[PDB]
């Protein structure tokens, strides 16, 4: 019926109105201090005043570092932008890593804008172009004006096109008996389809049929749009949308990333400031999440030191699972969590703790409940002592072969013999390493 993949039993942090977390609610078990710290961070993000705050989730493997960030993302909701990222995404073969980090920084700041649209829409009744006096003069186009007749409900208008508008009229291949939609902001034309006032079944081009639009031909409407600053940056970097030559040829060329200069970002910032000053736009700071932050090298860390001190940058969350690991790109320095101390001095570190046996048992119970399976209590205890023996992830991932082997014997419950069979078929890292050490030819 539904699909589950390593998550989606987690819905949020699951706190009270005072920020005190429960023992088990919202898909989480334990981790009370980390969930309270993440709730404080979520409240700080919702305060919408701070710029460039950074926390780091420090812990071991399989302890719930990605789950806390996903719970933060679901606690904020789809209204606030959230940009997930891996540490290996910053190395591109098209542009430098500093520009990619700047791009992902600007991709986490949103904006909500109420925008006015001037529209001419209706059914085309007549389309008559008139010719120029000399068409082969070299300078000046073939035609001079085109007369179009638009008919809508309770209205009929006649328009005289600029030829520049007529090029975008003709490129979507409109004709007599066609419903169109002209947006006066950019000159873009949408061909809705044939009007249903005429015949229907006599066509051979799988078209759709639309009635006449309600209201007058000329309209002004209010569309509420959501956007990021990075969208404006890539719109002004590669200009498409106009009716001139350059914006027309920009749609056909291959798109490529470029180093967007700071001057364009300052101009976009000034225009956005003018927009919010008028009472039109509203600014939404967001979250940038970077998992496996130890893959970053020293140059990206040194640029992060500069980028966190700007007055635009959002809240950035990091994660790592290294104790005393040398920083990549350096040769001798050893720093905690693979993160250099000059950036460590600007972070807030949140510890994540391992679990006990009963916590592993109830996590396995919730995972078996979510994946729609029925597990016997003795099999649950065997899975719990297996999870304490080897790993939590190994006990979690062996539930579905247990379900398949229980289904193949025409049964719904999972029993001890099924768990023993799944133990015999699939191995873990420790038994595989013990096979590797006492091996003949690098088995």
């Amino acid at each position: 019926v539904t699909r589950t993949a390593a998550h989606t039993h987690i819905k949020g942090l699951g706190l009270d109105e005072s920020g005190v977390a429960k023992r088990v609610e919202g898909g989480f078990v334990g981790q009370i201090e980390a969930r309270e710290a993440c709730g404080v961070i979520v409240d700080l993000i919702k305060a919408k005043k701070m710029s460039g705050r950074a926390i780091l989730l420090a812990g071991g493997p399989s302890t719930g570092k990605t789950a806390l960030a996903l719970a933060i993302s679901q606690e904020l909701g789809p209204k606030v932008p959230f940009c997930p990222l891996v540490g290996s995404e910053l190395y591109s073969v098209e542009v430098k890593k500093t520009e990619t980090l700047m791009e992902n920084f600007r991709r986490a700041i949103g904006l909500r804008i109420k925008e006015t649209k001037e529209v001419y829409e209706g059914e085309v009744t007549e389309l008559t172009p008139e010719d120029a006096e000399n068409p082969l003069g070299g300078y000046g186009k073939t035609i001079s004006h085109v007369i179009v007749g638009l008919k809508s409900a309770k209205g009929t208008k006649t328009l005289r096109l600029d030829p520049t508008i007529y090029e975008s009229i003709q490129r979507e291949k409109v004709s007599i008996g066609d419903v169109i939609y002209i947006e006066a902001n950019t000159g873009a034309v949408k061909r809705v389809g044939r009007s249903d006032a005429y015949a229907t079944e006599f066509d051979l081009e799988t078209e759709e049929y639309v009635p006449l639009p309600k209201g007058e031909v000329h309209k002004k409407k209010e569309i509420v749009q959501d956007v990021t600053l990075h969208d404006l940056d890539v719109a002004n970097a590669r200009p498409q949308g106009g009716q001139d030559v350059i914006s027309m040829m920009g749609q056909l060329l291959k798109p490529k990333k470029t180093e967007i200069t700071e001057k364009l970002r300052q101009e976009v910032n000034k225009v956005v400031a003018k927009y919010i000053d008028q009472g039109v736009a509203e600014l939404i700071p967001g979250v940038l999440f970077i998992d496996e932050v130890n893959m970053l090298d020293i140059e990206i860390f040194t640029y992060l030191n500069k980028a966190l001190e700007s007055n635009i940058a959002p809240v950035v969350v990091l994660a790592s699972n290294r104790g005393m690991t040398t920083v990549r790109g350096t040769e001798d320095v050893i720093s905690p969590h693979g993160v250099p101390p000059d950036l460590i001095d600007r972070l807030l570190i949140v510890r994540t703790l391992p679990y006990d046996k009963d916590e592993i048992r109830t996590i396995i119970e919730r995972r078996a409940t979510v994946e729609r399976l029925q597990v016997e209590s003795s099999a649950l205890d065997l899975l719990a002592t297996m999870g304490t023996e080897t790993s939590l992830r190994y006990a979690l991932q062996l539930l579905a072969p247990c379900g398949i082997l229980a289904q193949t014997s025409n049964r719904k419950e999972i029993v001890v013999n099924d768990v023993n069979e799944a133990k015999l078929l699939f191995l873990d890292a420790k038994r595989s390493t013990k096979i590797l050490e006492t091996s003949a030819n690098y088995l």
Binding site: P61, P255, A429, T433, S439
Partner: protein, 442 residues
């Protein structure tokens, strides 16, 4: 086609209770690995879960890629199976993360249901009106069957279809509305007056009768990666074949995911998960493993099967040794299938199956000698010797491989250990690691 290495494996050879037969579908031996592969096959066929990593580990010449090919054969059609090697990730146009994202997204199919109209009728009248420069084209088509008569209006693409493989007013054609296909079934009118050129020596066919227009529900499968490449830019369908899809942005993938969820909600399209198979996964950098560790946790993720023939060895991109050449983070979230070496009876049955696949008849004593050499040397050497022995047998004009042909093939073509012995006995003849060689025989 041609006889390949794994052309004899059609399926996995399993029962209805997932109990593997000792010899079925071209696979012998390896009972527990085939049982686990059948469990993985059932987990893929259910399609309920996503992002499970399976590792197949063992010594060389054991049956890892043979097991993967058996899984791919038992998978059936309309389920994608993206099989790549480890060295294909490194490119000069795409990053490692982008190439791995494309490899992940090539393994999820979207099954889309569409409605179409089929028209089969005798062509009566074709009127085509074109401009002077040939740009604007429109027209009318009067088509008939034995019972009705319909006049249709034509578009640009339909007239382009009619102009190619020209129809000449009296033929019988077929029309698909959703696909836009033109298929000339034949000719029924049998006109006497014919121009010297053209000439529809199309096979005679009766005029179709009954309803002119018929409705049909059709279905077709596309991949997620094709949707992103098509929606990436203006000419994405050319980039699907030229491979010029350089670093598709994330907003495209988010909008495609939202539209796929919308199509699932409206009942138009369904999602079929597939298998991504990485052969020789140990040839990957640590950044690729770090990306895989987060890409396996998403909803739109396939079942990832990796194959390794390595023991404890140095991980690429770092300076420490790891089990199977893989870091412990990726080894934590994976379940491992272990393959084991063969006996003489299994090797004899494998050589019998490979001799039956290459259509080479073998004697009993030649089979015993091949079994003995495949016990001493590797299995692949004695497998490769069969075609050479067959060619030697055809040179002496007898279509049955005897013992002396295998002896001559053993003498003519060398092993690894024998070649190592000959190199180590005559080290001065070859160029060593320091570049010193003795060419002169004085």
């Amino acid at each position: 086609s041609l006889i390949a290495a794994h052309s004899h494996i059609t399926g996995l050879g399993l029962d209805e209770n997932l109990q593997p037969r000792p010899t079925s579908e071209g696979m012998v031996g390896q009972l527990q690995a085939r049982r686990a592969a059948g469990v993985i096959l059932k987990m893929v066929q259910n399609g309920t879960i996503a992002g499970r990593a399976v590792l197949v580990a063992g010594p060389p010449s054991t049956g890892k890629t043979a097991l993967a090919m058996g899984v791919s054969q038992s998978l059936g059609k309309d389920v994608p199976f993206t099989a790549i090697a480890g060295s294909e990730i490194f490119s000069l146009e795409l990053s490692k993360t982008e190439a791995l994202t494309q490899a992940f997204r090539k393994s999820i199919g979207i099954k889309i249901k569409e409605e179409t109209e089929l028209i089969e009728g005798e062509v009566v009248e074709i009127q085509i009106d074109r401009s002077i420069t040939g740009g604007h084209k429109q027209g009318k088509l009067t088509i008939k069957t034995t019972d009705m008569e319909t006049i249709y209006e034509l578009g640009n693409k339909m007239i382009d279809g009619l102009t190619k493989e020209k129809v000449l007013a009296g033929d019988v054609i077929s029309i698909d509305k959703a696909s836009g296909k033109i298929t000339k079934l034949g000719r029924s009118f049998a006109r006497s007056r014919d121009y010297d050129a053209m000439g529809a020596d199309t096979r005679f066919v009766q005029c179709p009768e009954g309803e002119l227009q018929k409705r049909k529900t059709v279905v077709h499968t596309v991949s997620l990666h094709e949707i992103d490449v098509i929606n990436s830019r203006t000419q994405g369908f050319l980039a699907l074949f030229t491979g010029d899809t350089g670093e598709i942005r994330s907003e495209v993938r988010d909008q495609i995911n939202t539209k796929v969820a919308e199509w699932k909600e409206e009942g138009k399209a369904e999602i079929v998960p597939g298998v991504l198979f990485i052969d020789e996964v140990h040839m990957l950098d640590i950044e690729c493993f770090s990306f895989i560790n987060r890409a396996l946790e998403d909803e739109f993720a396939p079942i990832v099967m990796m194959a390794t023939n390595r023991g404890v060895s140095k991980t690429r991109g770092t300076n420490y040794k790891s089990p199977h050449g893989l870091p412990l983070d990726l080894l934590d979230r994976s379940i491992i299938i272990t393959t084991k070496s063969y006996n003489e009876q299994e090797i004899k049955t494998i050589l019998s199956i490979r001799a039956q696949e290459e259509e080479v008849e073998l004697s009993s004593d030649a089979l015993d000698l091949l079994t003995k050499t495949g016990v001493e040397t590797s299995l692949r050497y004695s497998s490769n010797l069969i075609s050479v022995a067959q060619q030697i047998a055809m040179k002496r004009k007898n279509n049955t491989v005897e013992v002396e042909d295998v002896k001559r093939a053993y003498l003519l073509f060398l092993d690894s250990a024998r070649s190592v012995k000959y190199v180590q006995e005559n080290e001065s003849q070859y160029i060593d690691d320091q570049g010193n060689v003795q060419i002169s025989i004085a």
